[PDB]
């Protein structure tokens, strides 16, 4: 099972306001028009690789998808991150858990913390073991694919936990669609509007027109011939 990322999964790269400007950052982003693996809650929660980092999304009824586990082998040999939502409340732990044969939220803890229309979106980065979580939530009309569109994900948390993650898994409301994409180090040109929200982006490695847009630091390109790169 697979679906297309489209232009989903850009996020604010740093804690800075910018406005009416185009800023070319390079960071771990979900590549434009890449595939994302597609799974179900019911009618399929195996461990997945984490690689350099994850984009995770869900189109769902309401709060069927509820959390995630991150670690190496999920079997108490080292610390392992757990993130949970119950009713209104976010809950987080990192203990050396031995997880169940099939973990669900049924209807040595070095860090712990608390705080048919739904698209959840998230990005998880673990550079130098610092677990950075970005997110967005939006209304949607149908719950069985990613929508073609754009909205930038904003920061929620930075966990300074230092863990060497290689795998992850989701947690869900057993007594409905979720999607996974992988980040890569890419130059993106980001359009910050008048109000300092990112409203559009160009993946500068997607196609030659996107190299041209990024060579010019511009989303409009006038007629011409542009020396965008040198190949070898």
């Amino acid at each position, epitope marked *: 099972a697979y679906t*297309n990322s489209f232009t989903r999964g850009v996020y604010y790269p740093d804690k800075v306001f910018r406005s009416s400007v185009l800023h070319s950052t390079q960071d771990l982003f979900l590549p434009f028009f890449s595939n994302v693996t597609w799974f179900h809650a019911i009618h399929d929660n195996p461990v997945l690789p984490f690689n350099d980092g994850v984009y995770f999304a869900s189109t769902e009824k309401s709060n069927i998808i509820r959390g995630w586990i991150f670690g190496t082998t999920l079997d108490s040999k080292t610390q392992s991150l757990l993130i949970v939502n119950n009713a209104t409340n976010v809950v987080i732990k990192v203990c050396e858990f031995q997880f169940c044969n099939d973990p669900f939220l049924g209807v040595n803890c070095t860090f712990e913390y608390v705080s048919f229309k739904n698209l959840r979106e998230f990005v998880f980065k673990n550079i130098d073991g610092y677990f950075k979580i970005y997110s967005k939530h939006t209304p949607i009309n*149908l719950v*069985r694919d990613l929508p073609q569109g754009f909205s930038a994900l904003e920061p929620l948390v930075d966990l300074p936990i230092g863990i060497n993650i290689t795998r992850f898994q989701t947690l869900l409301a057993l007594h409905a669609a979720y999607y996974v994409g992988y980040l890569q180090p890419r130059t993106f040109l980001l359009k910050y509007n008048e109000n300092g929200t990112i409203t559009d982006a160009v993946d500068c490695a997607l196609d030659p027109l996107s190299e041209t847009k990024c060579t010019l630091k511009s989303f409009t390109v006038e007629k011409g011939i542009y020396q965008t790169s040198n190949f070898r």
Partner: antibody
Amino acid sequence: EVQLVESGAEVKKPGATVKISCKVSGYTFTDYYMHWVQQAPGKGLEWMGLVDPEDGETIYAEKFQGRVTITADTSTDTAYMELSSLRSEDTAVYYCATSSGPSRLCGGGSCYHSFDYWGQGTLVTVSS
Amino acid sequence: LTQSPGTLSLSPGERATLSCRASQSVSSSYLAWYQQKPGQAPRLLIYGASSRATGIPDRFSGSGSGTDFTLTISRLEPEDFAVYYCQQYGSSPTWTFGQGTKVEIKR
């Protein structure tokens, strides 16, 4: 592989009501949205509405609003549609279809809406 | 949706080009093309404005830019005596068909 198997052809007066159905096979019936689509004789197609076969959530096209109704059942793997207070222009082919294969089984590897599969086309006649 | 021509034909082994057009009230990559031999139910040929359905011949091809979206049929065959429809979709749910083009081989 996948099969959508519709009702027989049907006949009614103007101001009456007709019912159409579609039994489904070869994929897990809940997992692909169910759709109804209409086609006047030799004409371009038009969409009538959709339902989720997992949950019964249904929405309708403007041109057939109030006249149409749709439902589906997971025990019989089957979809059903009604068209009500008929006119001669409702003489048409009618189709069940699906749109949202998570794997588009025997049709594509990475998916983007569109329609996955269609039934054989139920014929309807409306006349005095 | 606008679609043209109303009907099109040329010799076998040649090309036929169809266009589908609208205001941006419906979305660019959510565009697909369907073949119908008269009396059969329609069949998906192109999706993503440009990909092929599995097992459909490599001589069928879609492309588009901005407001204008196209099917080109190439190496024309007797199989191509069919009505071809675009459809286009958007975030606000509207599974919307084109006017349809009746394709033929020249005789």
